[PDB]
Amino acid sequence: GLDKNTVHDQEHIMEHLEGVINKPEAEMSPQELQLHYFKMHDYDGNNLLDGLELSTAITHVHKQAPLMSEDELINIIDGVLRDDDKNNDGYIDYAEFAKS
Amino acid sequence: GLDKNTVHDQEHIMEHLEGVINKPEAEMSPQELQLHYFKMHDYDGNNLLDGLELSTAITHVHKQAPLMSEDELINIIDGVLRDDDKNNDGYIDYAEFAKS
Amino acid sequence: GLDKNTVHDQEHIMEHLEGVINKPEAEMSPQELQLHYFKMHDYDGNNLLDGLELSTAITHVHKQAPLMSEDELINIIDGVLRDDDKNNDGYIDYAEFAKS
Amino acid sequence: GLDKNTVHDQEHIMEHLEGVINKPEAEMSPQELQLHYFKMHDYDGNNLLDGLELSTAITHVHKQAPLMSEDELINIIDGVLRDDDKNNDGYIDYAEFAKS
Amino acid sequence: PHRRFEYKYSFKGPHLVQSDGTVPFWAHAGNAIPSSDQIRVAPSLKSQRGSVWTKTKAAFENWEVEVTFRVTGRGRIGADGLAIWYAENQGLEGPVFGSADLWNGVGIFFDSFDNDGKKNNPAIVIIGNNGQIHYDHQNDGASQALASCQRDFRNKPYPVRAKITYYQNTLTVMINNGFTPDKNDYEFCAKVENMIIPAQGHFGISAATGGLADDHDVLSFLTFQLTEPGKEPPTPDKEISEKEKEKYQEEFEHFQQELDKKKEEFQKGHPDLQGQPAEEIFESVGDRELRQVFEGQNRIHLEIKQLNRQLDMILDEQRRYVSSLT
Amino acid sequence: PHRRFEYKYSFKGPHLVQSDGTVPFWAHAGNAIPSSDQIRVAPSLKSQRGSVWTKTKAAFENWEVEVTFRVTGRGRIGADGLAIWYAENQGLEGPVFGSADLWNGVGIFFDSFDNDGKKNNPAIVIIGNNGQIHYDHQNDGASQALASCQRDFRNKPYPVRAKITYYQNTLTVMINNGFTPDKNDYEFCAKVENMIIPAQGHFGISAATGGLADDHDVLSFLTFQLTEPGKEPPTPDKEISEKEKEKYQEEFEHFQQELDKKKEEFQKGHPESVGDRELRQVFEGQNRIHLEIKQLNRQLDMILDEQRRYVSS
Amino acid sequence: PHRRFEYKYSFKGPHLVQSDGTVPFWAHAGNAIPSSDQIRVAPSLKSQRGSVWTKTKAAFENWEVEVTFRVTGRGRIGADGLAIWYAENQGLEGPVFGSADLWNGVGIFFDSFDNDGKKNNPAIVIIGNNGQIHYDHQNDGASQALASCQRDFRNKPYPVRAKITYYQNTLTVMINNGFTPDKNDYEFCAKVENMIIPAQGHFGISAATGGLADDHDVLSFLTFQLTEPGKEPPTPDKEISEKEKEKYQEEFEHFQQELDKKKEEFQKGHPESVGDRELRQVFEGQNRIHLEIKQLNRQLDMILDEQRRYVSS
Amino acid sequence: PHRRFEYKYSFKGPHLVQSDGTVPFWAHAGNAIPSSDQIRVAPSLKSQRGSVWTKTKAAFENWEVEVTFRVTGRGRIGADGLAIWYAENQGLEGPVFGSADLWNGVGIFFDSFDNDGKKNNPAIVIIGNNGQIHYDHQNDGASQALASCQRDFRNKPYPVRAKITYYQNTLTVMINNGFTPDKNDYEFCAKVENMIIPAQGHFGISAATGGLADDHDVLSFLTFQLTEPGKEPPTPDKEISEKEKEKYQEEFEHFQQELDKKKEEFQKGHPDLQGQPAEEIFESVGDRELRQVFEGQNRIHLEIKQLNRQLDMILDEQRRYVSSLT
Ligand SMILES: [Ca+2]
Ligand SMILES: [Ca+2]
Ligand SMILES: [Ca+2]
Ligand SMILES: [Ca+2]
Ligand SMILES: [Ca+2]
Ligand SMILES: [Ca+2]
Ligand SMILES: [Ca+2]
Ligand SMILES: [Ca+2]
Ligand SMILES: [Ca+2]
Ligand SMILES: [Ca+2]
Ligand SMILES: [Ca+2]
Ligand SMILES: [Ca+2]
Ligand SMILES: [Ca+2]
Ligand SMILES: [Ca+2]
Ligand SMILES: [Ca+2]
Ligand SMILES: [Ca+2]
Ligand SMILES: [Zn+2]
Ligand SMILES: [Zn+2]
Ligand SMILES: [Zn+2]
Ligand SMILES: [Zn+2]
Incomplete structure (x- = not known):
């Protein structure tokens, strides 16, 4: 549910960047891979994150596993929006995302 | 399974001719109503009856009833084709249809 | 050279109107066939005649005959322009053409 | 008709190489100048000579002279192909050309 | 030759589907959407696969198949195209036009996307396979193409009709280009001589969709068993006489014309019925x-x-x- | 006004559908075929009906919906058209544009077939209903049309964008004509002043297909809750200082530019x-x-x- | 001004060529291929040259030429371009646009190949010459350009129309861009004031083709002698009364309308x-x-x- | 098989014409305009007819003909198209693609206008004639079409190359579509089995123009006599040895590379030479x-x-x- 360890995962970014990025790095600063996560999970290209983008980031297949319940995802995204977002715009900005 | 009494039914043909032709008749000759049946069930307009048109004729839905199984449909249509169609063309003509 | 008898020719208009006009008439007034000639020989559709159109009208193959000399055609067209045309516009109008 | 002295002519090859290559040489080996002749007269770039290229070579216009008749051209080229080309391929290779 | 229409391996409108929602004597899998009139084997969405196969195997030595279909696209490039199979086992799911690879039989592919980049598409490719040869998807089966005529079947004003005939071990594909409303206007496409196919197998159709997207409708599928005139026994003893034929045919025609006259005065009698032109459709x-x-x-x-x-x-x-x- | 994007009443690509096969927070019924990038509410087959509605009811006083859609047909005549609804109950299947009749709420109909025969189609019709008057299907709702419009949204080169805003009891519909790929290029279509709608209800879309056949794809559906600048209460001492944001955003943009430069030499390096x-x-x-x-x-x-x-x- | 169409210095379709194979009152030389509807002055083969000149010299003080032409090329670069000349002698073959150099007169060049490499082509260049200065072929006549223009006349959907008028010692070139089928839609291109040209000379057109290849077709060439309203002497008592003209023209128009009506039912009657x-x-x-x-x-x-x-x- | 290039029935650039203005060993009639590089058989004017035939008759039993041609039109509809004839007599002028009707031989018609209205044009039609059968001009020879592949050869970025081979009484037409600059990229079009043609006849090409107008260029025409490997006598006694071949081939290669190096430093030494791209041409x-x-x-x-x-x-x-x- 968008935890500190979930964002700080080398295997996840290495799997996501496979194909698009032909540059496997050894070790990166936590801010660097969190920036990679934020840039990768913004599909619309508006430099912003919302509930749908967060839901896609959390509940995705990868390469079996049971699907998470809709109520749990709703609660997790509601908590994330209530905690990180302070401007009440609905979108999650990297300025707001830098707290966690 | 395409019996003598099945074709000789005024209610079904009266329901079928409703809408397309606004001529509700009281009583018609048996040959006339069998001609109406043969002409109305020929969707392709080739003045011929085949397995698909007979399947539509048998498995019919008016305005509930359970649908006939595939095996019964196949057996009935195979028996009708073997009994009536003598020229082995696959189609049933009006001359072949008038026997039964 | 644009004579009265040359314009008043039933065979020439009947041959020219063949194909385009499927209406063979028996006899017509001289003004009628001269109007037919004037309308047929105006290719540009400006309701006017010039030296080039007159040259095409006089010197055409039709259905062998020797070709007329360029000097004779120049003299004939110059005489026609000097006689019939009075507004000195260069074009021959039906108002000017009605004299001959 | 493609004689030994005809190919061994410095003036013709010097005129041909003028413009395309700006290297006017004084004296060249007979094999070198015959190589220049063979390479320059091959327009198609297949390193081969055929009837069309030989016809262009024989009927040539520099900067008057009457054109050779068709029969003389045909006889000369047929004789050259019969004498030089031994593999009956229709083309003349450099190995076949070096004999004469 | 002599043709016999086999109903168990055929479907056509306007009553194609039943109340259950399935095609009689046919099994559909994938993204196929059967309707009352047509079967959309693969719709205009991205990465769609569909196939409609026969349940019972067909045991024929000489057969004829008539396929009426439409391939409609917004752009000028098709997605994958159709595939008509006479196989040994129902390959309902797979990556070869929505059907499984390594089939034992014959397949006519209406390829509409040029994977090989030869600018030779759309084209119709006949491929025979014994069940151990992979289909070259990245090259449109250029090496395996027994016979390939080049034809356009996309965005035609009328449905494209194809006729595939297996007779004396010779497969003939004759394609109506879909430019005229006439049915019997077939134009020759290709033939393959001395091709061995399994004696019994399933008849099927399939379609797929790649990067671009097309709508792959199949309006009708008709199967005819073909027999030689000398091989087929006539058996004229089962027929009664020509007298009953002469007594029935003229009364049938009389009934047809009487019904036409009966419908004539009531087609215009009720003004609720309205028509619609098809010229503006294309x-x-x-x-x-x-x-x-x-x-x-x-x-x-x-x-x-x-x-x-x-x-x-x-x-x-x-x-x-x-x-x-x- | 101040806008807040509500994710629970929205869907968009390119990951619209999940591995289960259902749109998150949305229930679809009829012949709707949701996909990875768009929802085909009604395909181009004969007599098709589809609808996609929200599961949980939305309780807003001022809202805004941005809908991107394509209505594509082979011919020049549309079949039925699209319908966007702010209702009280999930209509799902029904006889009005693939949705149930006698709805308690507002509905915007993108009618593309002229049933009335007045040659005034395709047109956008806003109809409010309390649930007691049947929709006049044979007259395109001419009598019930609170406000009409006249736009063509069929076979456009670019997706057609519409924006429906309920603000201060006024419903404004502003529709892009689909001739440009720009998003914020809305043109005024219609407005209705002093219209009463239920305080809470479901957001839904629906489509139908008649004798002719059109494909009604919906690419996105974004819902924004609208509040007044004066009505929204501020929350002092909760936000972070602007100095930290200014320090962070410059390095964020520098790193994204560096990432784009890194992608530049590797996009063509490996074909x-x-x-x-x-x-x-x-x-x-x-x-x-x-x-x-x-x-x-x-x-x-x-x-x-x-x-x-x-x-x- | 008052215009008089001169037939001896003109050609037009659809009967441009005769049975003999030559343009009436015009002499063609080079690779010109006259046809029934147009004259191809230079085809799309490599190194082609053609010219069509008048036989008899034209003696005018104020004149006007309307030239309709098409310059069509497969590529985006023209070969040489067209040239319209009012000269003193028939150039026929030559090295300047398929016409002889050192001409005594005026020449309008529709240059379509940038020999100078200044990216200022295609362009229309008016050059006057007394017969003693050679034309700078390698510089598109930049030094000799009395007045220039900048138009594109290649691969236009409609034929390109140009009007060159010598009036009161002023030469005006007004060129239609070829985007409309209207004839009287000329736009101003260039003008030269106080230019001396020979009193009598030959009217001609010519074209050439270089490394690339363009087709230079000429559909028409119409010459009008221009006179001032005050300078033209009237001829009283020579024209007919206007009453006869008014009586005649109404019956002429009625009969032509009747003839059109007669053609209406017979055009479709016999397929x-x-x-x-x-x-x-x-x-x-x-x-x-x-x-x-x-x-x-x-x-x-x-x-x-x-x-x-x-x-x- | 074994191929021998026959020069008397061939022409190609860049020196196609002589100073007289005529093609050697070829006679041209009609509106054909031979140039230094190509022959424009029919220009883009209305009602143009042209033909170029051979003077001497060709006596071959198995032959191969390679034709490079272009058909360019401003619109999307062609005028008539090309025609390649192997006949018995030179029909210099006529109404069948600019050549006389009732020919005794074979003719490949590259028809670009649909007279029949079947929307199946442009198409390549092989027609054999014994000299007493009229060509159906109003129907594109649909009844007389022995083999007809459907292909587009108009407005191609590269010249269209066709190869017609007569071998063991089988006529094979293989057409390069003109999409790639490569020469040996032929794609199969059609074949006709067991066709009888005259033993000796004239090789010719022709073109015509109707309502619309196209430019019909022919860049090259190459004729190869084909002989079976077993029928051709080898006669190795006329060859001297392989030693002279080994002594000459490497010196030829050395001269080629020396000339390439000699031209390399002077291609850029003189800046007067300039190039021109061909991508913008199409x-x-x-x-x-x-x-x-x-x-x-x-x-x-x-x-x-x-x-x-x-x-x-x-x-x-x-x-x-x-x-x-x-
Ligand atoms: Ca975002
Ligand atoms: Ca925010
Ligand atoms: Ca039937
Ligand atoms: Ca029968
Ligand atoms: Ca006129
Ligand atoms: Ca006048
Ligand atoms: Ca060579
Ligand atoms: Ca050799
Ligand atoms: Ca493919
Ligand atoms: Ca391909
Ligand atoms: Ca409606
Ligand atoms: Ca209406
Ligand atoms: Ca220039
Ligand atoms: Ca310049
Ligand atoms: Ca034709
Ligand atoms: Ca045809
Ligand atoms: Zn992941
Ligand atoms: Zn019934
Ligand atoms: Zn006449
Ligand atoms: Zn020389």
Whole structure:
């Protein structure tokens, strides 16, 4: 549910960047891979994150596993929006995302 | 399974001719109503009856009833084709249809 | 050279109107066939005649005959322009053409 | 008709190489100048000579002279192909050309 | 030859589906959407696969298949195209036109996307396989192509009709180009001589969709068993006589004309029935693009009208302001 | 106004559908075929009906929905058209544009078939209903039309964008004509003042298909809750200082530029067309001409209001 | 001014060529291929040259030539271009646009190949010559250019029309761009004041083809002698009364309408397309937009000159 | 098989014509315009007919003909198309593609206009004739078509190359589609089995033009006599040895590389030589139409700019007229 360890995962970014990025790095600063996560999970290209983008980031297949319940995802995204977002715009900005 | 009494039914043909032709008749000759049946069930307009048109004729839905199984449909249509169609063309003509 | 008898020719208009006009008439007034000639020989559709159109009208193959000399055609067209045309516009109008 | 002295002519090859290559040489080996002749007269770039290229070579216009008749051209080229080309391929290779 | 229409391996409208929602004597899998009139084997969405196969195997030595189909695309490039299979096992799911690879039989592929980049598509490719040869998907089966005629079957004003005939071990594909409403207007495409196919197998159709997207409709599928005139036993003893034929045919024709006259006065008697032309249904891609440009110019036209009116208003305002001072 | 994007009542690509096969927070019924990038509410088959509605009811007083859709047909006549609804109950299947009749709420109908025969189609019709009057299907709701419009949304080169805003009891529908790929290029279509709608209800879309056949794809559906600047209570001492944001955003943009530069040499390191580019250029030129004429109109209105003040002097 | 069409220095379709195979009153040389409807002065083969000149010399003080032509090329670069000459002698073959150099007269060159490499081609260049200065072929006659222009006349959808008028020792070239089928739609290109040309000379056209290849067709060539209204002497009592003309013309128009009606039922009695019509409609809409903007410009000029007179009051 | 290039029935550039202006060993009639590089058999004028035939008859039993040609039109409809004849007598003029009807031989017609109205054109039709069968001009020879593949050869970016081979009484037509600059990229079109043609006859090409107009260029014509490996006598005694071949081949290669190096430093030494790309030469009809529309919009752009600056000028005039009264 968008935890500190979930964002700080080398295997996840290495799997996501496979194909698009032909540059496997050894070790990166936590801010660097969190920036990679934020840039990768913004599909619309508006430099912003919302509930749908967060839901896609959390509940995705990868390469079996049971699907998470809709109520749990709703609660997790509601908590994330209530905690990180302070401007009440609905979108999650990297300025707001830098707290966690 | 395409019996003598099945074709000789005024209610079904009266329901079928409703809408397309606004001529509700009281009583018609048996040959006339069998001609109406043969002409109305020929969707392709080739003045011929085949397995698909007979399947539509048998498995019919008016305005509930359970649908006939595939095996019964196949057996009935195979028996009708073997009994009536003598020229082995696959189609049933009006001359072949008038026997039964 | 644009004579009265040359314009008043039933065979020439009947041959020219063949194909385009499927209406063979028996006899017509001289003004009628001269109007037919004037309308047929105006290719540009400006309701006017010039030296080039007159040259095409006089010197055409039709259905062998020797070709007329360029000097004779120049003299004939110059005489026609000097006689019939009075507004000195260069074009021959039906108002000017009605004299001959 | 493609004689030994005809190919061994410095003036013709010097005129041909003028413009395309700006290297006017004084004296060249007979094999070198015959190589220049063979390479320059091959327009198609297949390193081969055929009837069309030989016809262009024989009927040539520099900067008057009457054109050779068709029969003389045909006889000369047929004789050259019969004498030089031994593999009956229709083309003349450099190995076949070096004999004469 | 002599043709016998086999109903168990055929489907056609306008009553194609039953109340259950499935095609009789046919099993459909994937993204196939059967309707009352047609079967959309693969719709116009991305990465769609569909197939409709026969349940019972067909045991024929000489057969004929008539396929009526449409392939419609918004653009000028098709997605994958159709595939008509006579196989040994129902390959319902797979990556070869929505059907499984390594089939034992014959397959006619209506390829509409040029994977090989030879600019030779759309084209019709006949491929035979014994069950151990992979299909070259990245090259449109150029090496395995027994016979390939080049034809366009996309965005035609009329449905494209194809006829595949297996007779004396010779497979003939004759394709109506879909430009005329006439049915019997077939034009030759290809033939393959001395091809060995399994004696019994399933008849099927399939379609898929890649990067681009097309709508792959199949309106009808007709199967005819073919027999030689000498091999088929006539057996004329089962027929009664020609007298009953002569007594029935003219009364049948009389009934037809009587029904036509009966319907004539009531077709116009009730004005509720209305028709619809089909000429406006068809429109080419370039024609649609030019119509879109012409429609887009109307905004500029209206804005220029508004500008001219407001200039006229300011002109009138300047006119009425002239005499105020003097 | 101040806008807040509500994710629970929205869907968009390119990951619209999940591995389960259902749209998150949305229930679809009928012949709707949700996909990875769009929802085909009604395909181009005969007699198709589809609808996609929200699961949980939305309780807003001022809201805004941005809908992107394509209505594509082979012919020149549409089948039924689209319908966007702010209702009280999930209609799902029904006889009105693939949704149930007798709805308690508002509905915007993109009618593309002229049942009335008045040659006034395709048109956008806003209909409010309390649930007691049947929709006049044979007359395109002419009697119930609170406000109408006249736009063509069929076979456009670009997806058609519409924006429906309920603000201060006024419903405004502003529709892009689909001739440009720009998102914020809405043109005024219709408005209804002093319309009563239920306080809470379901957001839904629906489509149907009649004798002819059109494909009704929906690419996105974004819902924004709208609040007034004065009505929204501020929350002091909760936000972070702007200095930290300024320090962070410059390094964020620098790192994203560096990432783009890194992708630049690796996109081609490991391995549109003619005609399409020409058509795009033609449409761009038409849009530029339209924008220049709009600028001329604004300049001329400027000089008109400048000369207006000179009269009294 | 008053115009008189001179037939001896003109050719036009659809009967441009005779049975003999030569243009009447015109001599053609080089690779010119006259046809029934147009004269191909230079085809699209490599190193082609052609010219069509008048036989008899034309003695005019003020004249006007209307030339309709098409310059069509497969590529985006023209080969040489067209040339229209009012000279003193028949050049026929030569090295300047398929015509002889050192001409005594005026020449209008529709240069389509940039030999100078200044990216200023295709362009229309007017060059006057007394017969003593050679034409600078490698520089497109930049030094000898009395007046230049900048138009594109290649691969236009409609034939390109040019009008060259010598009036009061001033040569005016006004060129239609070929985007509309209207004949009287000339736009100003160039003018030269106080230019001396021979009193009598030959009218000619010519074309050439270089490394690339273009087709230079000429559809028509019409010459009008121009005279001033005051200089032209009237001829009283020679023309007929206007009453006879009015009586005749109404029956002429009635009979031509009756003839059209007669053709109407017989054209179909005895036995464009989609896309082409759409492109024609697009071009018509573009022309309508251009005309409406021109009318807007006229209205703005009118209000400007109206407000000009209000300053002094 | 074994191929021998026969020069008397061939022509190619860049020295196709002589100083007299005629093609050697070829006679041209009609509106054919031979040039230094190509022969324009029928130009883009209305009602043009042209033909180029051989003078001496060709006596071959198995032959191969390679034809490089271009058919260019402004519109999307061709006029008539090309025709390649192997006949018995030179039909210099006529109504069948610019050649006389009732020929005794084989003819490959590259028909580009659909007279029959079947929307199946342009198409390549092989027609054999014994000299007493008229060609169905109004139906594109549909009844007489022995083999007809459907292919487009108009407005291609590269010249269209066709190869017609007569071998063991089997006529094979293989057509390069003209999309790649590579020469040996032929794609199969059609074959006719067991066709009887005259033993000796004239090789010719012809073209015509109807309502619309196309440019029918022929760049090259190459004729190869084909012989079976077993029938051709080898006769190795005429060859001297392989030693002279080994002594000459490497010196030929050395001379080639030396000449390449010699030309390398002087290709860039003199800057007068300049190149020209061929990509911009090709442009599709729809692309040209869209480019014409985009070019036509520039007049509207410039007029709007002029109107804008005039409105700004009148705004400045009003601004300076504001302060005059007070
Ligand atoms: Ca985002
Ligand atoms: Ca935020
Ligand atoms: Ca039937
Ligand atoms: Ca039967
Ligand atoms: Ca006239
Ligand atoms: Ca006059
Ligand atoms: Ca060679
Ligand atoms: Ca050899
Ligand atoms: Ca493919
Ligand atoms: Ca391919
Ligand atoms: Ca409606
Ligand atoms: Ca309506
Ligand atoms: Ca130049
Ligand atoms: Ca220049
Ligand atoms: Ca034809
Ligand atoms: Ca045809
Ligand atoms: Zn992941
Ligand atoms: Zn019933
Ligand atoms: Zn006549
Ligand atoms: Zn030489």
